Symmetry: C2
Subunit: 95 residues, 2 copies
């Protein structure tokens, strides 16, 4: 399996991309468990910039409500966690 | 707005998924002080497992040939970096 440079570049270049976020881990908030799943997948800006000085950052955002099953043995309740999801990204000086 | 639970879950569940891998100086003999792209995207095992202790690991993998433009001012030429890409994953006990 050989991947063409174009496909490699276009795909590695700064843009929004599904990222895994660890619940009870990423955001210091709620470091406790009982969550199913204990992590979620959310679009974010990732990749690299044509310059070692630039950085990949959002230029379009919005919160997404992720339904998360919360559990305390007898009762399992579908709760809702919210987080920042990116829709547009750009390369720019990490000053 | 709101992502259903039977969506949050089936996406967050351990599986192969595009992952951005930085191209550190690890590239030996790669004179080209400038790699383009400076990173690549590759399917790996990510997400989470229905319990602490277990982990997400590959049960199917293989090396992929990433065409990478190498540069040393005079000019540049297409190189080819190779890394493991996961094709199957599973949640297994802690090592």
């Amino acid at each position: 399996k050989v991947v063409s440079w174009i496909d490699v570049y276009t795909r590695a270049t700064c843009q929004p991309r599904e990222v895994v976020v660890p619940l009870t881990v990423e955001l210091m908030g709620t470091v406790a468990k009982q969550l199913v799943p204990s992590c979620v997948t959310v679009q974010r800006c990732g990749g690299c910039c044509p310059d070692d000085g630039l950085e990949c950052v959002p230029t379009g955002q919005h919160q997404v409500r992720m339904q998360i099953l919360m559990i305390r043995y007898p009762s399992s309740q579908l709760g809702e966690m919210s987080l920042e999801e990116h829709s547009q990204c750009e390369c720019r000086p990490k000053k």
